[PDB]
């Protein structure tokens, strides 16, 4: 697979691992309208929309992950008012699917997929049907590609996680859960702040704690900043407490109404 | 539906290809992939030559998306570098900015066959192998290596440095591995290597080694066997597994090519079979792909340690005799 071993000389690493301080500063413009809690709930919501779009279109998890990263990268710089996220989500799926070599999902199929996932699975957030046609998707794709500075190849924690568990000799025991925890980390900013292997290690650690598996010697035998991994484990643990206390289906209609809205021309 | 302030601000800041670059009338290439122009900067900060490619079609096509994705990541002196990407919102055209290579092996070889320095052939071979090695290490296959895709830089800081590129078609099967001709479904590293061997033969003699007038191509295989000979079972055991192996046996008889071998072909073109040059060429042009040398192993061949050593500038400091590119 192309550029498999190029992370440390890649655009992902050299341009798209951000400082947390810069991120939260750029976030302040949407925080005039939304609370911090509400902004994160929004992040979760649209991680599920993208996942649902992916599943409907029958895309592999890696294509869904790349599309989720493109969306994250776009709103890491710009405000939610700049382009409607309901248009951006499926545009990210459309572009990601071309890069990762699934194919150009047909006009009819992309728009029918967007329409149908929102109607059947997200009616609690959206009363009205999906309003965008393909001319809108095509336009948005151009803006997305420019904002990302044409950086399309994205690395994820699934491949390193696979390598780590194979080395342990615990594929069947741990991989199901650790792979599940990696999916959940996309509900957070982690992929914008840490190299993918570090996220892999954190998820595999939490899978080990949950399944009562002693992996202390294995982790110790690694040459990694074990403090950086403790930071990621903390965000994972915090995320599952937000999950418990968050009723997405009661809250999102009101949260989405508080989003700053795109101004039309004069 | 999109925010107005956001739109007008990005539109204001967007660098437009027609504003940054002078290129009207300077078209140097046209093919399957689209048009390539020799471009100069209008605001004279650089005053160096650039290649402007306008990608065929509209919008972000599968192929457009692939070129951008890859070239945005690749970084090696012997592979063509993407300098900048312009998205033109008005007409949905994509433009790619590359550095300008004045020469390439198609014109260089054609110029010599119309009629040099110690170690230009060796240097060209070495830099080609170096770049393909870089691509192969990153699991990027070229899939259409030929003289026209081996660019060579003209006067300037990178004088005589090879730049591997993929220019498209302005098709011929002269550089195509026998396994592809017998219906192999997938492209491989080894297929790129065969093509490098065909280029190396052409650099030594100035003629294409396998020149010739669905996946199966009879005459092209006839010319390979006319040069290399017909392979023994022992030389290529998995040949039985190629989809068109039965058509090969239907159409061809080992007996026909009994007098034929690479030793004999190269001897006719005054390349000695006891030379390191030849012994390397034979390892590149091995018919069974699994018995073919890898790019790294080629780079380590004693050919490159024998006088003359390969140089960074393939022209070895000599003045360039070749003409500049004609505009179209
Ligand atoms: C559609 C398309 C067209 C050309 C390329 N491409 N590929 C290469 C490699 C030598 C790195 C493989 C170079 C190019 N394009 C170019 N103008 O050199 C890639 C994709």
Task: Kindly list the residues from chain B whose CB atom is less than 8 angstroms away from the CB atom of residue A264.
Answer: 1, 4
Distance from CA of B145 to the nearest CA of A (A): 18
CATH of B1-100, one of 3.40.190.170, 3.40.50.720, 3.30.980.10, 3.30.200.20: 3.30.200.20
Q: Do A103 and B5 touch (CB under 8 A)?
A: no
Q: How far apart are CA B235 and CA B239, in angstroms?
A: 9
Distance CA A37, CA A30 (A): 12
Q: In terms of CA atoms, which chain B residue is nearest residue A96?
A: B65
Q: Do A82 and B75 touch (CB under 8 A)?
A: no
Per CB-CB distance under 8 Å, the chain A contacts of B10 are: 143, 146
The answer to whether the CB of A49 falls within 8 A of the CB of A117 is yes
What angle, 0 to 180 degrees and rounded to 10, lies between the N-to-C axes of helices A85-99 and A36-56? 50
Cα angle: B46, vertex B51, B54; to 5 degrees: 130
Residue A152's nearest CA partner among A140, A144, A143 is: A144
Q: Which fold has domain A22-153?
A: Cyclin A; domain 1 (1.10.472)
| For helices A61-77 and A134-147, angle between their N-to-C axes, nearest 10 degrees | 70
Q: Chains A, B: CB contacts under 8 A, how many? A: 91
Architecture of domain B101-328 in this structure: Orthogonal Bundle (1.10)
Q: Is B92 in Cβ contact with A11 (below 8 Å)?
A: no
Annotated binding site of B: 28-36, 53
Per DSSP, chain A holds a count of helices (H) and strands (E) of 14, 0
Is B144 a known active-site residue?
Answer: yes
Question: Domain A1-21+154-266 class?
Answer: mainly alpha
Q: Measured between beta carbons, which residues in chain B are less than 8 angstroms from residue A95?
A: 60, 65
Alpha-carbon span B17 to B26, nearest angstrom = 14
**Radius of gyration of chain B from Cα atoms?**
22
Q: What are residue A117's phi and psi, to 5 degrees?
A: -65, -45
Q: What experiment produced this structure? A: X-ray
CB under 8 Å, gap of 24 or more: what pairs does B283-288 form?
Answer: B284/B193, B284/B194, B284/B196, B284/B197, B284/B200, B285/B194, B285/B197, B285/B198, B285/B201, B285/B209, B285/B228, B287/B178, B287/B224, B287/B228, B287/B231, B287/B235, B287/B236, B288/B231, B288/B235, B288/B236, B288/B237, B288/B238, B288/B239
Cβ B6–A95 below 8 Å, yes or no? Answer: no
Q: Which of B305, B284, B249 is nearest to B119 (CA)?
A: B305
Q: Which of A4, A2, A63 is nearest to A196 (CA)?
A: A4
Give the start-to-end residue ranges of the domains of chain B. Answer: 1-100, 101-328
Quote the CA–CA distance of A58 and B30 in Å, as a whole number: 38
Query: Does residue B63's CB lie within 6 angstroms of at least one atom of ligand 1?
Result: yes
Going A37 to A38 to A41 to A47, the CA torsion angle's sign is negative
Q: How far is the CA of A21 from the centre of ligand 1 (A)?
A: 38
Q: With contact defined as beta carbons under 8 Å apart, do B287 and B236 qualify?
A: yes
Decide if B87 touches A, using CB distance below 8 A.
Answer: yes
Spell out the alpha helix ranges (H) of A125-157.
Answer: 134-147
The 3-state DSSP class for residue B52 equals strand
Backbone angles phi, psi at A32, to 5 degrees: -70, -25
**Helical H segments across chain B, by residue range:** 4-13, 17-20, 62-71, 105-114, 120-137, 178-181, 189-205, 218-228, 245-251, 262-268, 276-284, 295-299
> By CA distance, what is A4's nearest residue in B?
B138
- Report the separation in Å between the CA atom of B31 and the middle of ligand 1, taken as the mean of its atom positions: 13
Place of tokens 């080992």: B254
B15 close contact with A: CB closer than 8 A: no
Q: A-chain residues within 8 Å CB-CB of B1?
A: 84, 87, 132, 136, 262, 264
Q: Does ligand 1 have an atom closer than 6 angstroms to the CB of B209?
A: no
Region(s) of chain A under CATH 1.10.472.10? 1-21+154-266, 22-153
Q: Is residue B132 within 6 Å of ligand 1 at its C-beta?
A: no
> What does the longest C-alpha to C-alpha distance in chain B come to?
78
The two structure tokens encoding residue B253: 């008889």
Strands B150-152 and B103-104, bridge-based pairing: antiparallel
Name, in order, each residue with C-beta under 8 angstroms of B72's C-beta and a sequence gap of 6 or more: A11, A150, A151, A152, A153, B82, B85
Cα B209 to middle of ligand 1, angstroms: 25
Helix (H) or strand (E) holding A37: helix A36-56
Cβ of B164 closer than 6 Å to ligand 1, yes or no, is yes
3-state secondary structure of B246: helix
Preceding omega of B308 cis (within 30 degrees of 0)? yes
């Amino acid at each position: 697979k192309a550029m498999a071993g190029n992370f440390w000389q890649s655009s992902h690493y050299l341009q798209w691992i951000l400082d947390k301080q810069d991120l939260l500063k750029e976030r302040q413009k949407d925080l005039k309208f939304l609370s911090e809690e509400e902004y994160w709930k929004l992040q979760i919501f649209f991680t599920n929309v993208i996942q649902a779009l992916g599943e409907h279109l029958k895309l592999r998890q890696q294509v869904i992950a790349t599309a989720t990263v493109y969306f994250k990268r776009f709103y890491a710089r710009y405000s939610l008012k700049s382009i409607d996220p309901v248009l951006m989500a499926p545009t990210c799926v459309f572009l990601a699917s071309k890069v990762e070599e699934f194919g150009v999902v047909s006009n009819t199929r992309l728009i029918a997929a967007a329409t149908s996932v929102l109607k059947t699975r997200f009616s609690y957030a959206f009363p009205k049907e999906f309003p965008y046609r393909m001319n809108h998707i095509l336009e948005c794709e151009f803006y997305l590609l420019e904002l990302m500075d044409c950086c399309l190849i994205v690395y994820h924690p699934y491949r390193p996680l696979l390598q780590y568990v194979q080395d342990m000799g615990q594929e069947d025991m741990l991989l199901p859960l650790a792979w599940r925890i990696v999916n959940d980390t996309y509900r957070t900013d982690l992929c914008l702040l840490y190299p993918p292997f570090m996220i892999a290690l954190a998820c595999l650690h939490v899978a080990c704690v949950v399944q009562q598996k002693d992996a202390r010697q294995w982790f110790a035998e690694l040459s990694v900043d074990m403090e950086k991994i403790l930071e990621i484990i903390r965000v994972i643990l915090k995320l599952y407490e937000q999950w418990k206390n968050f009723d997405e289906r009661k809250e999102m209609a009101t949260i989405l109404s508080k989003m700053p809205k795109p101004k039309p021309p004069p | 539906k999109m925010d107005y302030d956001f739109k007008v601000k990005l539109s204001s800041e967007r660098e437009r290809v027609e504003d940054l670059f002078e290129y009207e009338g300077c078209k140097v290439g046209r093919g399957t992939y689209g048009h390539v122009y020799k471009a100069k900067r209008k605001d004279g900060k650089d005053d160096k030559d650039y290649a402007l490619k306008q990608i065929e079609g509209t919008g972000i096509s599968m192929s457009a998306c692939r070129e951008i994705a890859l070239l945005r990541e690749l970084k090696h002196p012997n592979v063509i570098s993407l300098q900048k990407v312009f998205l033109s919102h008005a007409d949905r055209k994509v433009w790619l900015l590359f550095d300008y290579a004045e020469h390439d092996l198609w014109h260089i070889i054609k110029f010599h066959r119309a009629s040099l320095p110690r170690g230009m052939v060796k240097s060209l071979l070495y830099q080609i192998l170096d770049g393909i090695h870089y691509l192969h290490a990153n699991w990027v296959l070229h899939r259409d290596l030929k003289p026209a895709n081996i660019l060579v830089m003209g006067e300037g800081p990178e004088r005589g440095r090879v730049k591997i590129a993929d220019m498209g078609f302005a098709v011929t099967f002269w550089y195509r591995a026998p396994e592809l001709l017998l219906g192999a479904r997938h492209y491989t590293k080894a297929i790129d290597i065969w093509a490098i061997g065909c280029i190396f033969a052409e650099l030594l003699t100035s003629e294409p080694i396998f020149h010739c007038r669905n996946p199966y191509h009879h005459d092209q295989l006839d010319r390979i066997f006319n040069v290399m000979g017909f392979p023994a079972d022992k030389d290529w055991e998995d040949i039985k597994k190629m989809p068109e192996h039965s058509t090969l046996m239907k159409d061809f008889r080992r007996n026909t090519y009994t007098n034929c071998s690479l030793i004999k072909y190269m001897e006719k073109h005054k390349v000695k079979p006891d030379s390191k040059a030849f012994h390397l060429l034979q390892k590149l042009l091995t018919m069974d792909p699994i018995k073919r040398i890898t790019s790294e192993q080629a780079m380590q061949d004693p050919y490159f340690l024998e006088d003359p050593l390969p140089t960074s500038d393939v022209f070895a400091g000599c003045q360039i005799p070749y003409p500049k590119r004609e505009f179209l």
